[PDB]
């Protein structure tokens, strides 16, 4: 009768079935972790937005009291740049990157994103009448965009796409570490190069702050480049793959987007909301935080089940249904407040161009395998498809 967290989805595009009873307990419920530790489970949309702006919640997975949802994550110590930091140190870091992630900067990259998407679909269409869309499209689009974002030179695009793929797919754990060391090593060299080279992108922008205000040291700069890739790659890739699967499993919603390409921006917001692939943001209370007449005591864990929060029926009528006309505004698929996704302006435009161009170019797109033989991620990680066999 106590509900374990995290759990696997049964259906790639719905929250795990066991959480259903807890949806009625707003704004706070509770779940049990692998070791019997109980944590708060924020089911209320308004409560979730208020808590995610609260400086008394911490992302510091270095603390002995930080809830590690799995036994496997028990090995989490170094603090990860931006997300693994509290303010003021977190804001100091974010302030240096924010100017690279304006909506104007997002908008300026449309033609570069269009060219990446067009090149990958041209290659996929030329290669044959079927594809594994995760490897052929969903995985390389976001890593190639992050190339353009960071200012990786064209000649290095292949190496970068490959090493970023090993990072996610790494046949062996040794491939994941070699890829990581290879990219950190590579970012090191590219910073020296960009000292004695021109360059547009986040890396040149941070070489500029460095000179102009001593600001990012070279090790910090490498950490920023690494987290940007890691935060930007699988999230975007999994939205492309699971959005596609989901669209193919809802023929009448897919037909409305084919009919009216103008709906695609609204559709991307509704898919972010409905899919909520960044499921289960984790905090610990540093101090007592009240919510109504309930108190989250110092040292107690707080889990934000993105997928349920984005299906709060006091905000979204018929929340478990895909609807292109119902405002998906104020969704928390990119989080909210202190740690709200830095790359969300860019992510939205990648999704709009990737899905918009796929639909335009491949009107016959359909699953090339039965939908229940297609593997998807377990409950303890970013949700999404591991493969997506398609034909057209
Ligand atoms: C569909 C794509 C994406 C989704 C669904 C997504 C989701 C999220 C979420 C939910 C958070 C908040 C995590 C928490 O509060 O615990 C986050 C943070 C972040 N995301 Fe994204 N994200 C996406 C794309 C990207 C991209 C493209 C970048 C590119 C650089 C990026 C960089 C970041 C960074 C740096 C943070 C930490 C911000 C901070 O600590 O202040 N993300 N993302
Ligand atoms: C800056 O640090 C990061 C930022 C984002 C990510 C990717 C990510 N973003 C938001 C929510 C996430 C939520 C996740 O699990 C529920 C997850 O599993 C690997 C990755 C997530 C990884 C990061 O690396 C530690």
XYZ file of N, CA and C in Angstrom, residues 185-381:
591
model
N 39.355 16.161 -22.533
C 40.633 16.360 -23.241
C 40.460 17.217 -24.489
N 39.450 16.935 -25.322
C 39.194 17.676 -26.589
C 38.799 19.128 -26.286
N 37.945 19.348 -25.284
C 37.460 20.704 -24.915
C 38.656 21.549 -24.443
N 39.551 20.926 -23.666
C 40.844 21.498 -23.250
C 41.592 22.066 -24.441
N 41.885 21.222 -25.435
C 42.605 21.616 -26.677
C 41.828 22.726 -27.395
N 40.508 22.589 -27.561
C 39.718 23.540 -28.397
C 39.780 24.938 -27.766
N 39.812 25.027 -26.433
C 39.953 26.322 -25.698
C 41.296 26.995 -26.052
N 42.413 26.265 -26.058
C 43.741 26.800 -26.472
C 43.631 27.301 -27.915
N 43.121 26.452 -28.811
C 42.858 26.757 -30.244
C 42.059 28.056 -30.389
N 40.983 28.225 -29.615
C 40.008 29.341 -29.780
C 40.602 30.615 -29.184
N 41.658 30.476 -28.379
C 42.513 31.609 -27.943
C 43.182 32.206 -29.182
N 43.774 31.343 -30.011
C 44.575 31.694 -31.213
C 43.748 31.423 -32.483
N 42.411 31.450 -32.401
C 41.490 31.304 -33.555
C 40.296 32.231 -33.367
N 39.550 32.582 -34.444
C 38.289 33.304 -34.282
C 37.324 32.348 -33.558
N 36.055 32.309 -33.968
C 35.035 31.415 -33.393
C 33.842 32.186 -32.851
N 32.640 31.748 -33.224
C 31.349 32.063 -32.571
C 30.875 30.826 -31.793
N 30.252 31.029 -30.639
C 29.660 29.951 -29.827
C 29.960 30.147 -28.354
N 29.316 29.337 -27.520
C 29.410 29.385 -26.032
C 30.882 29.386 -25.602
N 31.742 28.600 -26.238
C 33.164 28.456 -25.811
C 33.905 29.787 -26.041
N 33.676 30.444 -27.183
C 34.278 31.764 -27.506
C 33.673 32.831 -26.589
N 32.361 32.793 -26.370
C 31.660 33.685 -25.415
C 32.322 33.589 -24.033
N 32.767 32.403 -23.609
C 33.310 32.195 -22.237
C 34.806 32.540 -22.200
N 35.519 32.402 -23.318
C 36.920 32.898 -23.490
C 36.905 34.432 -23.382
N 35.815 35.060 -23.842
C 35.563 36.522 -23.808
C 35.324 36.988 -22.368
N 34.448 36.323 -21.610
C 34.246 36.653 -20.170
C 35.594 36.448 -19.472
N 36.291 35.356 -19.793
C 37.569 35.007 -19.124
C 38.499 36.216 -19.222
N 38.860 36.635 -20.443
C 39.665 37.855 -20.690
C 38.992 39.045 -19.987
N 37.722 39.318 -20.298
C 37.001 40.567 -19.948
C 36.743 40.705 -18.437
N 36.780 39.619 -17.655
C 36.480 39.654 -16.200
C 37.075 38.457 -15.443
N 38.112 37.794 -15.973
C 38.807 36.645 -15.347
C 37.897 35.446 -15.090
N 36.647 35.507 -15.582
C 35.443 34.850 -15.016
C 35.576 33.330 -15.085
N 35.273 32.626 -16.205
C 35.415 31.173 -16.226
C 36.893 30.784 -16.339
N 37.411 30.084 -15.337
C 38.741 29.426 -15.411
C 38.604 28.239 -16.385
N 39.709 27.745 -16.945
C 39.695 26.773 -18.071
C 39.071 25.441 -17.645
N 39.226 25.051 -16.383
C 38.656 23.784 -15.857
C 37.141 23.966 -15.697
N 36.715 25.115 -15.189
C 35.281 25.492 -15.095
C 34.692 25.511 -16.515
N 35.433 26.047 -17.477
C 34.931 26.234 -18.861
C 34.647 24.859 -19.484
N 35.573 23.921 -19.313
C 35.469 22.489 -19.723
C 34.249 21.845 -19.043
N 34.033 22.105 -17.752
C 32.887 21.567 -16.979
C 31.597 22.104 -17.593
N 31.550 23.402 -17.933
C 30.352 24.044 -18.548
C 30.076 23.374 -19.901
N 31.097 23.231 -20.745
C 30.951 22.589 -22.079
C 30.424 21.151 -21.905
N 30.985 20.373 -20.976
C 30.594 18.967 -20.683
C 29.142 18.891 -20.207
N 28.733 19.718 -19.249
C 27.360 19.605 -18.689
C 26.375 20.031 -19.772
N 26.725 21.034 -20.569
C 25.847 21.529 -21.654
C 25.568 20.362 -22.598
N 26.592 19.627 -23.016
C 26.404 18.425 -23.869
C 25.535 17.386 -23.155
N 25.866 17.062 -21.897
C 25.178 15.968 -21.156
C 23.726 16.406 -20.889
N 23.456 17.666 -20.548
C 22.089 18.141 -20.217
C 21.247 18.246 -21.495
N 21.889 18.436 -22.653
C 21.239 18.819 -23.924
C 21.003 17.654 -24.879
N 21.739 16.557 -24.738
C 21.791 15.500 -25.768
C 20.620 14.536 -25.562
N 20.637 13.695 -24.533
C 19.632 12.610 -24.408
C 18.235 13.174 -24.180
N 18.094 14.256 -23.425
C 16.778 14.890 -23.199
C 16.159 15.196 -24.581
N 16.867 15.940 -25.422
C 16.315 16.391 -26.717
C 16.052 15.141 -27.581
N 17.014 14.223 -27.653
C 16.941 12.985 -28.447
C 15.713 12.177 -28.024
N 15.503 12.049 -26.715
C 14.388 11.229 -26.194
C 13.067 11.931 -26.508
N 13.029 13.259 -26.542
C 11.776 13.958 -26.916
C 11.505 13.711 -28.408
N 12.545 13.700 -29.242
C 12.333 13.472 -30.700
C 11.760 12.062 -30.882
N 12.393 11.028 -30.309
C 12.009 9.604 -30.469
C 10.617 9.361 -29.860
N 10.373 9.780 -28.622
C 9.115 9.418 -27.932
C 7.975 10.258 -28.513
N 8.241 11.507 -28.887
C 7.241 12.328 -29.608
C 6.811 11.572 -30.875
N 7.766 11.017 -31.626
C 7.484 10.341 -32.917
C 6.647 9.077 -32.671
N 7.115 8.225 -31.772
C 6.372 7.027 -31.357
C 4.954 7.449 -30.992
N 4.841 8.379 -30.052
C 3.543 8.844 -29.526
C 2.669 9.348 -30.681
N 3.234 10.131 -31.595
C 2.444 10.695 -32.716
C 1.929 9.544 -33.574
N 2.757 8.539 -33.852
C 2.380 7.373 -34.698
C 1.328 6.523 -33.974
N 1.290 6.541 -32.644
C 0.299 5.743 -31.887
C -1.018 6.539 -31.726
N -1.065 7.817 -32.138
C -2.272 8.694 -32.100
C -2.568 9.255 -33.489
N -2.995 8.390 -34.439
C -3.117 8.780 -35.842
C -3.881 10.090 -36.073
N -5.004 10.312 -35.381
C -5.851 11.513 -35.572
C -5.106 12.770 -35.108
N -4.283 12.707 -34.046
C -3.467 13.878 -33.617
C -2.331 14.106 -34.631
N -1.717 13.046 -35.146
C -0.642 13.187 -36.166
C -1.210 13.841 -37.448
N -2.401 13.442 -37.888
C -3.086 13.936 -39.119
C -3.375 15.433 -38.987
N -3.752 15.922 -37.793
C -3.983 17.374 -37.574
C -2.683 18.151 -37.785
N -1.515 17.590 -37.462
C -0.219 18.308 -37.620
C 0.243 18.278 -39.089
N 0.039 17.158 -39.778
C 0.284 17.003 -41.233
C -0.551 18.024 -42.016
N -1.851 18.095 -41.717
C -2.838 19.052 -42.272
C -2.361 20.481 -42.042
N -1.897 20.788 -40.825
C -1.597 22.187 -40.421
C -0.237 22.301 -39.744
N 0.855 22.471 -40.523
C 2.195 22.638 -39.968
C 2.303 23.774 -38.951
N 1.392 24.739 -39.009
C 1.334 25.867 -38.068
C 1.054 25.401 -36.647
N 0.471 24.211 -36.468
C 0.190 23.661 -35.113
C 1.478 23.155 -34.449
N 2.563 22.940 -35.190
C 3.738 22.208 -34.650
C 4.268 22.914 -33.395
N 4.499 24.245 -33.349
C 4.927 24.874 -32.097
C 4.022 24.532 -30.897
N 2.696 24.660 -31.023
C 1.742 24.296 -29.954
C 1.894 22.801 -29.629
N 2.047 21.954 -30.639
C 2.175 20.492 -30.472
C 3.417 20.149 -29.634
N 4.522 20.864 -29.818
C 5.795 20.627 -29.092
C 5.554 20.881 -27.595
N 4.823 21.935 -27.237
C 4.511 22.266 -25.818
C 3.645 21.150 -25.248
N 2.650 20.688 -26.008
C 1.690 19.683 -25.519
C 2.451 18.366 -25.361
N 3.348 18.029 -26.286
C 4.169 16.791 -26.177
C 5.137 16.890 -24.985
N 5.748 18.042 -24.748
C 6.626 18.243 -23.575
C 5.811 17.936 -22.308
N 4.614 18.498 -22.236
C 3.699 18.343 -21.093
C 3.297 16.868 -20.959
N 2.760 16.288 -22.026
C 2.118 14.949 -21.996
C 3.186 13.885 -21.720
N 4.410 14.073 -22.226
C 5.459 13.025 -22.175
C 6.298 13.170 -20.906
N 6.674 14.400 -20.523
C 7.325 14.728 -19.221
C 8.474 13.744 -18.957
N 9.423 13.677 -19.894
C 10.491 12.645 -19.915
C 11.524 12.900 -18.807
N 11.685 14.144 -18.342
C 12.582 14.459 -17.203
C 11.794 14.217 -15.926
N 11.447 12.964 -15.654
C 10.414 12.577 -14.659
C 11.123 12.357 -13.313
N 10.758 13.109 -12.285
C 11.264 12.859 -10.917
C 12.490 13.691 -10.618
N 12.318 15.003 -10.581
C 13.335 15.934 -10.046
C 13.450 15.676 -8.533
N 14.677 15.637 -8.015
C 15.002 15.245 -6.616
C 15.634 16.440 -5.904
N 15.112 16.727 -4.706
C 15.666 17.738 -3.774
C 15.792 17.139 -2.372
N 16.606 17.766 -1.523
C 16.528 17.605 -0.037
C 16.292 18.987 0.613
N 15.419 19.050 1.628
C 15.222 20.238 2.495
C 16.469 20.493 3.359
N 17.058 21.686 3.247
C 18.193 22.164 4.087
C 17.642 22.726 5.398
N 16.432 23.286 5.328
C 15.667 23.856 6.457
C 14.225 23.384 6.333
N 13.449 23.530 7.401
C 12.008 23.212 7.410
C 11.341 24.080 6.344
N 10.547 23.460 5.466
C 9.700 24.180 4.474
C 8.249 23.779 4.677
N 7.363 24.727 5.039
C 5.941 24.432 5.188
C 5.262 24.361 3.821
N 4.232 23.521 3.699
C 3.328 23.481 2.514
C 1.918 23.200 3.035
N 1.018 24.178 2.911
C -0.225 24.206 3.703
C 0.125 24.032 5.173
N -0.422 23.015 5.829
C -0.117 22.762 7.261
C 0.785 21.537 7.383
N 1.463 21.161 6.297
C 2.445 20.060 6.335
C 3.822 20.709 6.303
N 4.771 20.137 7.020
C 6.154 20.668 7.078
C 7.075 19.615 6.484
N 7.949 20.050 5.593
C 9.053 19.222 5.070
C 10.233 19.591 5.951
N 10.633 18.678 6.814
C 11.678 18.957 7.819
C 13.032 18.921 7.113
N 13.968 19.742 7.588
C 15.401 19.650 7.250
C 15.788 18.170 7.084
N 16.470 17.822 5.989
C 17.012 16.471 5.742
C 16.016 15.522 5.082
N 14.744 15.874 4.976
C 13.724 15.059 4.267
C 13.832 15.278 2.748
N 13.719 14.180 1.995
C 13.729 14.137 0.525
C 12.420 14.657 -0.050
N 12.526 15.310 -1.207
C 11.371 15.832 -1.994
C 11.550 15.389 -3.450
N 10.557 14.684 -3.981
C 10.546 14.232 -5.401
C 9.416 14.970 -6.100
N 9.704 15.505 -7.296
C 8.732 16.218 -8.178
C 8.463 15.338 -9.389
N 7.365 14.542 -9.396
C 7.032 13.670 -10.520
C 6.408 14.556 -11.608
N 7.296 15.148 -12.394
C 7.017 16.007 -13.582
C 5.756 15.541 -14.307
N 5.706 14.266 -14.668
C 4.585 13.677 -15.447
C 3.250 13.868 -14.708
N 3.183 13.696 -13.379
C 1.882 13.833 -12.675
C 1.556 15.312 -12.522
N 2.543 16.124 -12.147
C 2.408 17.594 -11.981
C 1.857 18.171 -13.292
N 2.383 17.725 -14.432
C 1.910 18.165 -15.772
C 0.573 17.519 -16.166
N -0.019 16.655 -15.324
C -1.386 16.104 -15.521
C -2.316 16.456 -14.354
N -2.057 17.577 -13.672
C -2.904 18.114 -12.569
C -4.175 18.690 -13.198
N -5.312 18.068 -12.918
C -6.574 18.358 -13.634
C -7.186 19.662 -13.109
N -6.569 20.317 -12.118
C -6.966 21.682 -11.682
C -6.291 22.721 -12.578
N -5.337 22.305 -13.408
C -4.634 23.176 -14.398
C -4.998 22.748 -15.838
N -5.082 21.445 -16.124
C -5.249 20.857 -17.478
C -6.503 19.972 -17.476
N -7.591 20.407 -18.122
C -8.790 19.567 -18.384
C -8.387 18.363 -19.247
N -8.972 17.190 -18.990
C -8.653 15.914 -19.685
C -7.132 15.750 -19.792
N -6.408 15.706 -18.653
C -4.950 15.837 -18.663
C -4.207 14.661 -19.299
N -4.825 13.490 -19.329
C -4.235 12.221 -19.823
C -4.481 12.075 -21.333
N -5.000 13.109 -21.975
C -5.270 13.084 -23.428
C -4.401 14.125 -24.127
N -3.891 13.767 -25.284
C -3.171 14.680 -26.198
C -4.201 15.598 -26.867
N -4.033 16.918 -26.732
C -4.968 17.924 -27.292
C -4.183 19.147 -27.751
N -4.146 19.421 -29.064
C -3.328 20.528 -29.632
C -3.946 21.905 -29.327
N -5.231 21.984 -28.997
C -5.936 23.277 -28.776
C -5.893 23.701 -27.295
N -5.798 22.762 -26.350
C -5.761 23.075 -24.892
C -4.376 23.605 -24.517
N -4.270 24.888 -24.171
C -3.039 25.520 -23.625
C -2.293 24.542 -22.696
N -1.058 24.201 -23.072
C -0.082 23.429 -22.273
C 0.861 24.402 -21.548
N 0.491 25.686 -21.453
C 1.324 26.742 -20.826
C 1.468 26.446 -19.323
N 2.590 26.877 -18.754
C 2.939 26.735 -17.318
C 3.293 25.275 -16.988
N 3.513 24.405 -17.984
C 3.982 23.008 -17.731
C 5.384 23.064 -17.118
N 5.812 21.983 -16.473
C 7.124 21.934 -15.774
C 8.053 20.892 -16.415
N 7.900 20.613 -17.716
C 8.764 19.638 -18.429
C 10.219 20.130 -18.445
N 10.436 21.449 -18.355
C 11.791 22.046 -18.262
C 12.118 22.476 -16.816
N 11.430 21.911 -15.826
C 11.483 22.372 -14.432
C 10.925 23.784 -14.290
N 11.449 24.533 -13.325
C 10.895 25.832 -12.887
C 11.765 26.429 -11.783
N 11.795 27.762 -11.742
C 12.462 28.543 -10.685
C 13.950 28.392 -10.758
N 14.574 27.979 -9.659
C 16.043 28.150 -9.464
C 16.787 27.434 -10.601
N 16.396 26.200 -10.945
C 17.194 25.320 -11.851
C 16.494 25.080 -13.201
N 15.514 25.908 -13.540
C 14.712 25.791 -14.787
C 15.692 25.621 -15.947
N 15.394 24.702 -16.859
C 16.269 24.370 -18.003
C 16.871 25.629 -18.643
N 18.197 25.733 -18.643
C 18.958 26.814 -19.308
C 18.763 26.738 -20.836
N 18.636 25.531 -21.403
C 18.588 25.293 -22.864
C 17.182 25.154 -23.419
N 16.157 25.577 -22.693
C 14.762 25.300 -23.118
C 14.347 26.092 -24.374
N 14.805 27.333 -24.566
C 14.558 28.143 -25.794
C 15.121 27.401 -27.012
N 16.330 26.857 -26.881
C 16.996 26.069 -27.950
C 16.284 24.731 -28.171
N 15.993 24.003 -27.096
C 15.322 22.687 -27.125
C 13.997 22.808 -27.875
N 13.199 23.816 -27.577
C 11.877 23.955 -28.235
C 12.069 24.049 -29.759
N 13.036 24.833 -30.211
C 13.251 25.099 -31.657
C 13.835 23.835 -32.301
N 14.719 23.115 -31.612
C 15.202 21.812 -32.132
C 14.007 20.884 -32.341
N 13.118 20.778 -31.360
C 11.959 19.860 -31.457
C 11.045 20.314 -32.607
N 10.750 21.609 -32.702
C 9.875 22.199 -33.747
C 10.416 21.864 -35.162
N 11.715 22.058 -35.397
C 12.371 21.845 -36.721
C 12.539 20.335 -36.972
N 12.938 19.542 -35.977
C 13.180 18.095 -36.160
C 11.858 17.394 -36.499
N 10.819 17.606 -35.690
C 9.523 16.904 -35.856
C 8.761 17.480 -37.062
N 8.816 18.797 -37.229
C 8.155 19.541 -38.318
C 8.678 19.099 -39.673
N 9.986 18.908 -39.793
C 10.652 18.499 -41.060
C 10.437 16.998 -41.307
N 10.568 16.159 -40.273
C 10.246 14.714 -40.363
C 8.837 14.542 -40.942
N 7.818 15.151 -40.331
C 6.400 15.050 -40.762
C 6.237 15.530 -42.218
N 6.924 16.603 -42.596
C 6.764 17.235 -43.932
C 7.319 16.266 -44.979
N 8.490 15.697 -44.720
C 9.301 14.964 -45.712
C 8.852 13.504 -45.778
N 8.338 12.945 -44.675
C 7.979 11.501 -44.624
C 6.511 11.308 -44.249
N 5.569 11.708 -45.123
C 4.150 11.596 -44.805
C 3.706 10.138 -44.600
N 4.381 9.152 -45.222
C 4.076 7.717 -45.045
C 4.730 7.118 -43.811
N 5.386 7.918 -42.965
C 6.099 7.373 -41.782
C 5.165 6.443 -40.983
N 5.648 5.259 -40.636
C 4.909 4.303 -39.782
C 5.929 3.424 -39.057
N 5.522 2.818 -37.948
C 6.343 1.799 -37.236
C 6.680 0.629 -38.171
N 7.939 0.199 -38.156
C 8.438 -0.955 -38.928
C 8.511 -2.172 -38.000
N 7.977 -2.067 -36.791
C 7.826 -3.207 -35.868
C 6.562 -3.002 -35.047
N 5.965 -4.094 -34.515
C 4.912 -3.991 -33.503
C 5.321 -3.066 -32.334
N 4.428 -2.172 -31.900
C 4.706 -1.106 -30.910
C 5.181 -1.693 -29.565
N 4.835 -2.938 -29.229
C 5.175 -3.537 -27.902
C 6.484 -4.332 -27.986
N 7.126 -4.385 -29.147
C 8.462 -4.995 -29.280
C 9.526 -3.894 -29.330
N 9.148 -2.620 -29.131
C 10.089 -1.476 -29.254
C 10.549 -1.074 -27.857
N 11.855 -1.230 -27.530
C 12.331 -1.000 -26.165
C 12.432 0.491 -25.812
N 12.124 0.817 -24.559
C 12.128 2.201 -24.014
C 12.865 2.175 -22.677
N 13.233 3.349 -22.175
C 14.125 3.495 -21.001
C 13.388 3.018 -19.742
N 14.155 2.488 -18.765
C 13.624 2.178 -17.438
C 13.214 3.429 -16.642
N 12.485 3.204 -15.548
C 11.891 4.275 -14.733
C 12.939 5.137 -14.033
N 14.195 4.706 -13.902
C 15.159 5.446 -13.038
C 16.013 6.418 -13.874
N 15.648 6.714 -15.114
C 16.500 7.562 -15.980
C 15.590 8.457 -16.821
